[PDB]
Amino acid sequence: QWALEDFEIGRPLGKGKFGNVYLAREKQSKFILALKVLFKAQLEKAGVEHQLRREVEIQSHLRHPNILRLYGYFHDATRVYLILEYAPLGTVYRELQKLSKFDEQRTATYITELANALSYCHSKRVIHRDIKPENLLLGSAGELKIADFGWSVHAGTLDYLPPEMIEGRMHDEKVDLWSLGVLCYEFLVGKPPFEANTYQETYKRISRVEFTFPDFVTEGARDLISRLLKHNPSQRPMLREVLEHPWITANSS
Ligand SMILES: Cc1nn(C)cc1-c1nc2c(-c3cnn(Cc4cccc(C(=O)N5CCN(C)CC5)c4)c3)c(Cl)cnc2[nH]1
């Protein structure tokens, strides 16, 4: 049973369409954490109380070192507050816009941590679906941490969604293997494989699987990425096969 007077709000960690994320500390234990604030009124206009209750339900008792812990929740009359873990080193997003590109060691390392987190999620019949750099945070040691679970369920922005999911078809655990491939590409190139200027256009890119490699992208990476980005959901590797991929094993930590 929590309240809003239990916390001292501080620096804004970022703003979102659902609401803003603020740094906060619990008064009694002096515990530092992230406090996401969402307005109940703007939540009704979107009608996603099922996904917020599902995101809370799913991310609650999910315990993994590469997954952002959801400690608890509460609410006043006006809004709805979520009590999350705090990621000291921030997001991978800003990390990416600062370095522009990632080296193969950082990329392969992130992919590994992400596969461990995904392999843990998949063993519980939980699909993240919405895997993107904006939902990737960093721990005190710089480890990866998957945060948002708004679109998470059991078995918009198109850049990371797979062919089957965008065409309205039936999607399974393999939608994350595609996302995992899209993220790997962006880490090495700095932009998504199917990036465009219009929604209508990116849709064609994804559905036809039209992507090309810049020169500086080695063969090891071109192989892993091409395997993950198959139109056929069954043609994609397992999380086991990904982890034990030559390029991953060679450059990961
Ligand atoms: C930031 C930050 N800096 N440092 C040192 C730490 C953080 C930090 N953030 C979180 C978050 C968190 C999840 N989503 N957000 C808001 C958000 C989402 C996506 C991107 C940004 C961001 O960094 N932006 C800066 C650049 N502009 C352009 C675009 C926005 C912000 C914050 C959570 Cl849930 C938990 N712990 C955190 N720690």
What's the CATH code of the domain at 211? 1.10.510.10
Using CA atoms, how far apart are residues 162 and 42, in angstroms rounded to an integer? 28
Annotated ligand binding at 36? The verdict is yes
Using CA atoms, how far apart are residues 181 and 225, in angstroms rounded to an integer? 5
Same domain, 60 and 119: no
The C-alpha angle 145, 149, 150, rounded to 5 degrees, equals 145
Same domain, 199 and 110: yes
Question: How big is the chain, counted in residues?
Answer: 253
The encoded tokens of residue 42 equal 């703007």
Same domain, 132 and 233: yes
The answer to whether 140 and 118 are in contact (CB under 8 A) is no
Secondary structure, 3-state, the chain: CCCCCCEEEEEEEEECCCEEEEEEEECCCCCEEEEEEEEHHHHHCCCCHHHHHHHHHHHHCCCCCCECCEEEEECCCCEEEEEECCCCCCEHHHHHHHHCCCCHHHHHHHHHHHHHHHHHHHCCCEECCCCCHHHEEECCCCCEEECCCCCCEECCCCCCCCHHHHCCCCCCCCHHHHHHHHHHHHHHHCCCCCCCCCHHHHHHHHHHCCCCCCCCCCHHHHHHHHHHCCCCHHHCCCHHHHHCCHHHHHHCC
Contacts of 103 (CB under 8 A, 6+ apart): none
Q: Which residue has the tokens 């998957």?
A: 146
Using CA atoms, how far residue 7 sits from 78, 86, 90, in Å, is 17, 14, 21
Same domain, 154 and 77: no
Using CA atoms, how far apart are residues 23 and 12, in angstroms rounded to an integer? 6
Annotated ligand binding at 167? The verdict is no
The answer to whether 102 and 96 are in contact (CB under 8 A) is yes
Same domain, 35 and 108: no
Q: Is 137 in the pocket of ligand 1 (CB under 6 A)?
A: yes
Same domain, 111 and 78: no
What's the CATH code of the domain at 34? 3.30.200.20
- Last residue within a domain, chosen from 36, 58, 90: 90
Exposed e or buried b per residue across 7-26, where buried means at least 16 C-beta atoms within 10 angstroms of its C-beta: beeeeebeeeebbebbebbb
The answer to whether 19 and 38 are in contact (CB under 8 A) is yes
Same domain, 1 and 123: no
Same domain, 113 and 204: yes
- Specify the resolution in Å: 2.8
The answer to whether 85 and 34 are in contact (CB under 8 A) is yes
Same domain, 33 and 109: no
Same domain, 95 and 117: yes
Q: Is 14 in the pocket of ligand 1 (CB under 6 A)?
A: yes
Q: Domain range holding 12?
A: 1-90
Pocket probe for ligand 1: among 89, 130, 137, 149, the residue whose CB has the most ligand atoms within 8 Å is 137
Closest Cα to atom 16, ligand 1: which residue? 14
The encoded tokens of residue 55 equal 């995101």
Annotated ligand binding at 148? The verdict is yes
Pocket probe for ligand 1: among 21, 84, 91, the residue whose CB has the most ligand atoms within 8 Å is 91
- Last residue within a domain, chosen from 42, 62, 90: 90
Using CA atoms, how far residue 4 sits from 8, 11, 76, in Å, is 9, 16, 8
Same domain, 53 and 126: no
- Last residue within a domain, chosen from 90, 124, 142: 90
Residues with a catalytic annotation lie at: 130
Query: What total of structural domains would you count in the chain?
Result: 2
Same domain, 35 and 115: no
Determination technique used: X-ray
Exposed e or buried b per residue across 46-70, where buried means at least 16 C-beta atoms within 10 angstroms of its C-beta: eebeebbebbeebbeebebebbbbb
The encoded tokens of residue 236 equal 């994609």
Q: Of 148, 147, 177, nearest to 162 (Cα)?
A: 177
The answer to whether 10 and 23 are in contact (CB under 8 A) is yes
Q: Which residue has the tokens 């009590």?
A: 83
